[PDB]
């Protein structure tokens, strides 16, 4: 059985091709007083943590190996030399980076075969399409990736360094401004939970602010680990509003609607209608209730007055990259695409592109 | 680019829409009402008290062609707002639907509705496709009927199909009955709709029924509150799981029949020894009456107890399974390799009714 390993900036998602979900989901962290993932989390108080995947790109290769070794031996309990292994990489991952990933897989782990797929392309596949534009928003990075018949269009790809971890930090900030105190790393973990549980994207931000200001209809309660119950009001929607107004955290970037539009505008005029009609959301930071409807409204306002816009937001989009890899690796038509160890031994580094 | 239509004709509900969509656009009651000319679906339902209601699709099989025509007409003109002469139309049928029945469906589509092309698929087969498989065994439990349909390389195996005349309508009826034991009163048609809502929202399948009963008797941890349309709040305890337990124990409603785990096993045993392993590893749940939380794990456990001690058992229960028949039809009718398989008006004219098979 082939393995699928989706290396995220915050979370590793890993499992077996043919399964409908990753068997293992754990943090992409390595800790020293070494420990990986959950074992590093459970010893948080005495460890210093490193994140080898920085904004989607692998930057610390020694620690990345530790993550991969942990994935195979501790999480999946497999010998890597026995399984073809599909790995994922960020949009615009440098060629040398991909080559190094490949070298480690073949030379350190001795995999019999491998393949490296672009994350957003796999999410597109998981939605049953080969043409469209993906918004992939994760923990450390957000990308817009337009794709034509399987090919990610590199000149049109946009990277935004605003994602899940920034939204968490911003919710800590504004909850504290309300009169709580969320500051410490343990308090960050609590706020991350509040974010995932109680936040949403308002269809109209100014209206939603007025509603919250006049009544308590939008309020929710939340029980802290120690039992103290607290109240979340307009923070519920001001937090993910940041995606649409990066100025909220002092960033000058256009918001996710405008970056989607700008990305489409960099593509060949003749494919743009297909992109607008096939906008797919993916990644954990696209999970906010209300996001698909807000994106529909926002892109309609930017796009030619006639254009047909469609947002696709799968329920399982926090795992759609992984799912796409699971589908792909299961196709009989894909089996000729694996890069084998024999092939790499002869052809060398070059073969992976 | 011409859109194809997908119409999934259920015992209780029509599911209808456009091939390529991820969900049916229209979902409405399979009812035709006439003054005590005719009303269909939601309007027939909302006008009950002045109409006589008919249900033309008994236990999955179309029994009244005049009324079924009215349903299809309403589906095209009122729900989907399409001229049927302009769209290839995929229709669905029950397991073991008689050949003359499929031929009648086809004759109506071509001669009354003037569809340019059409296809008829077995409902359970479409749900299998929707789960990404062409071999497996489907448990399809709807409003009026439940079937086990084993399928090998895309074809249902008729000799091994099991039909159980127990489904969603009976569970609703049984929940009303057991709620009455508590002193509640659910008698009217409006009251039955409230019980249907309670069932759909609060019911679940116990992993171990006798243990669940003990838990419910010794603690209030399984109880849920439900607000009635008139503001009154009632309490639901062990009725949450006694209701769908009926699926595993049809004696709860006085049926001598085997439960759904046993029919699944019996169905598999009617198939070639050489395919059984594949069937056990690909048991797909479909239909609204398979939606109860806990059903997959209980089925896994019961089938494990019945099957040879080595056997590898896997239950697939898609989140969207109340629509998976429709969804499979949407996918199939969207495929480039399916386009040849449409029966066109010309092929029908040249070959006669037999071509639909
Ligand atoms: C390296 O480079 C490649 C290039 C290429 C990649 C192939 C890729 C991995 C995938 O294999 C495909 C994309 C495949 O898609 C799949 O295999 C899987 C698809 C899934 C779960 C789709 C759902 O997300 C979808 O829900 C929203 C279901 C939903 C429900 C009802 C209607 C449908 C409508 C859908 O078009 C929206 C489709 C028409 O049915 C559609 O998908 C069911 C059909 C489907 O071929 C059966 C796709 C054609 O939509 O090949 C590789 C070999 C090498
Ligand atoms: C009239 O006679 C026919 C006979 C035949 C019908 C074909 C049918 C309509 C379908 O087109 C296919 C069954 C097709 O399946 C599909 O088109 C659609 C599939 C979907 C939404 C699957 C999900 O439900 C699934 O979730 C649980 C996703 C999930 C996620 C991860 C991994 C996968 C694992 C899956 O094997 C479980 C597969 C390996 O990926 C699988 O399906 C993604 C691949 C898939 O080909 C891309 C199927 C091969 O599992 O042809 C017609 C032309 C004529
Ligand atoms: N239901 C939810 N609502 C809001 N945010 C969520 C939800 N679920 C997860 N997230 C956020 O999604 C992020 C993780 O998503 P994902 O697994 O797609 O990221 P990654 O792949 O690790 O990061 P990247 O793609 O940036 O490298 C976390 O910031 C998490 O808090
Ligand atoms: N979430 C749920 N939990 C339990 N039961 C449900 C749920 N949702 C729907 N049902 C029941 O499912 C039944 C309808 O399912 P479905 O649409 O598959 O049936 P159908 O195709 O009309 O009938 P049949 O297949 O018997 O001809 C109704 O009895 C309904 O109450
Ligand atoms: Ca985990
Ligand atoms: Ca503190
Ligand atoms: Ca409806
Ligand atoms: Ca034909
Ligand atoms: Mg990611
Ligand atoms: Mg049905």
* B339 within ligand 2 shell (Cβ under 6 A): no
| Ion ligand 5 contact residues with beta carbon within 5 A | A 25-26
CA of A183 to the centre of ligand 6 (A): 7
The residue whose CA is least distant from atom 22 of ligand 2 is: B132
Instruction: Look up the CATH architecture of domain B123-166+256-320.
Output: 2-Layer Sandwich (3.30)
- Report how far ligand 3's centroid is from the alpha carbon of A254 (Å): 20
Scored b (16 or more CB within 10 A) or e, A184-205 reads: eeebbebbbebbbebbbbbeee
CA–centroid distance for A203 within its chain = 23
CATH of B1-122+321-357, one of 3.40.50.620, 3.30.420.40, 3.30.70.240, 3.40.250.10: 3.30.420.40
| Short-list B32, B56, B36, B55, CA closest to B44 | B32
- Cα separation of B132 and A326, whole Å? 12
Distances in Å between the alpha carbon of B63 and those of B9, B11, B36, B68? Answer: 12, 11, 21, 8
Which residues 6+ apart lie within 8 Å of B157 measured at CB? B149, B150, B151, B270, B271
Residue nearest atom 48 in ligand 1 by C-alpha distance: A128
Which stretch of DSSP H or E encloses residue B62?
A: strand B61-62
Q: Which of B221, B5, B274, B237 is nearest to B119 (CA)?
A: B5
Tell me which fold the domain B167-255 belongs to: Actin; Chain A, domain 4 (3.90.640)
Torsions phi, psi for A36 (to 5 deg): -125, 145
CA gap A158, A148 in Å, rounded: 16
Question: Taking the domains of chain B in order of start, what are their residue ranges?
Answer: 1-122+321-357, 123-166+256-320, 167-255
> Which element (helix H / strand E) includes A49?
strand A48-50
Rg from Cα positions in chain B: 21
Given this chain, do its domains B1-122+321-357 and B123-166+256-320 carry the same CATH topology?
yes
Report the DSSP pairing between strands A85-89 and A113-118.
parallel
Longest pairwise C-alpha distance within chain A = 71
Backbone angles phi, psi at A5, to 5 degrees: -120, 110
From the list B284, B37, B8, B345, the residue with the least C-alpha distance to B137 is B284
- Method underlying the structure: X-ray
SS3 B52: strand
Contact A88, A70 (CB under 8 A): no
What is the spatial distance between Cα B16 and Cα B28, in angstroms, rounded to a whole number?
9
- Tokens standing for residue B177: 């009955």
Burial of B108 (0-12, 13-18, 19+ CB in 10 A): middle
Distances in Å between the alpha carbon of B185 and those of B15, B169, B234, B302?
32, 18, 11, 34
Superfamily, domain A119-162+252-316: ATPase, nucleotide binding domain (3.30.420.40)
**CATH of region A1-118+317-353:** 3.30.420.40
Fold exhibited by the domain A163-251: Actin; Chain A, domain 4 (3.90.640)
CB neighbour list of residue A281: distance below 8 Å, 6 or more residues apart:
A134, A135, A137, A291, A292, A295, A311, A312, A313, A314, A317
d(CA B199, CA B213): 18
Q: Is B90 helix (H, G, I), strand (E, B) or coil?
A: strand
Q: How far apart (Å, rounded) are the C-alpha atoms in residues B19 and A128?
A: 14
Please state, in angstroms and rounded to a whole number, the distance separating the CA atoms of residues A335 and A332: 5
Interacting residues of A189 by C-beta distance below 8 A, sequence separation 6+: none
How far apart CA B279 and CA B135 sit, in angstroms, is: 7
- Residues B38, A352: Cα–Cα separation, whole Å: 66
Q: Which of A123, A169, A127 is nearest to A143 (CA)?
A: A123
**Angle separating helix axes B123-130 and B324-334, nearest 10 degrees:** 80
- CA terminus-to-terminus distance, chain A: 24
- How far apart (Å, rounded) are the C-alpha atoms in residues B99 and A275? 45
Contact yes or no for A286/A321 (Cβ under 8 A): no
Closest ligand to the CA of A184: 6
Which residues does a 6 A CB cutoff place in the pocket of ligand 1?
A 125-130, 150, 327-328, 331, 333-334; B 20, 22, 327, 330-331, 334
The CA-atom distances, in angstroms, between B124 and each of A261, B17, B147, B323, B329 are 42, 18, 8, 11, 11
First to last CA, chain B: 28
d(CA A214, CA A202): 16
What SS3 state is found at B139?
strand
Nearest to B280 by CA among B300, B297, B296: B300
- The secondary structure of residue A91, as a DSSP letter, is T
- Decide: helix, strand or coil at residue B355: helix
Which letter does DSSP use for residue A303 in this model?
S
Contacts of B171 (CB under 8 A, 6+ apart): B199, B203, B243, B244, B246, B247, B289
CA–CA separation, A276 vs A132, rounded Å? 8
For residue A230, give the 3-state DSSP assignment: strand
């Amino acid at each position: 059985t082939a393995l699928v390993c989706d290396n995220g900036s915050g979370l590793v998602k890993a499992g077996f091709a043919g399964d409908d979900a990753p068997r293992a989901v754990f943090p992409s962290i390595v800790g020293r007083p070494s420990y990986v993932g959950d074992e590093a989390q459970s010893k948080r108080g005495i460890l210093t943590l490193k994140y080898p995947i920085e904004h989607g790109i692998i930057t610390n290769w020694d620690d990345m190996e530790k993550i991969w070794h942990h994935t195979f031996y501790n999480e999946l309990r497999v010998a890597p030399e026995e399984h073809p292994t599909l790995l994922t990489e960020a949009p615009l991952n440098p060629k040398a980076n991909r080559e190094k990933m490949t070298q480690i897989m073949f030379e350190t782990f001795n995999v019999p075969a491998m393949y490296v797929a672009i994350q957003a392309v796999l999410s597109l596949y998981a939605s049953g399409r080969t043409t469209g534009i993906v918004l992939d928003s994760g923990d450390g990075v957000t990308h817009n990736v337009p794709i034509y018949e399987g090919y990610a269009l590199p000149h049109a790809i946009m990277r935004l360094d605003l994602a899940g971890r920034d939204l968490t930090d911003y919710l800590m900030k504004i909850l504290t401004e309300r009169g709580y105190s969320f500051v410490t790393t343990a308090e960050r973990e609590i706020v991350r939970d509040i974010k995932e549980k109680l936040c949403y994207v308002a269809l109209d931000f100014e209206n939603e602010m007025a509603t919250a200001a006049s009544s308590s209809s939008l309020e929710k309660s939340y029980e802290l680990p120690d039992g103290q119950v607290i109240t979340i009001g307009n923070e519920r929607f001001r937090c993910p509003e940041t995606l649409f107004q990066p100025s909220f955290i002092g960033m000058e970037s256009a918001g996710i609607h405008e970056t989607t539009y700008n990305s489409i505008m960099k593509c060949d005029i003749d494919i743009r209608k297909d992109l607008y009609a096939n906008n797919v959301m993916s990644g954990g930071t696209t999970m906010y209730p209300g996001i698909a409807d807000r994106m529909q409204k926002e892109i309609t306002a930017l796009a030619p007055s006639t254009m047909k816009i469609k947002i696709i937001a799968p329920p399982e989009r926090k795992y759609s990259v992984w799912i796409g890899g699971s589908i792909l690796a299961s196709l009989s038509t894909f089996q000729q695409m694996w890069i084998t160890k024999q092939e790499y031994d002869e052809a060398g580094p070059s073969i992976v592109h």
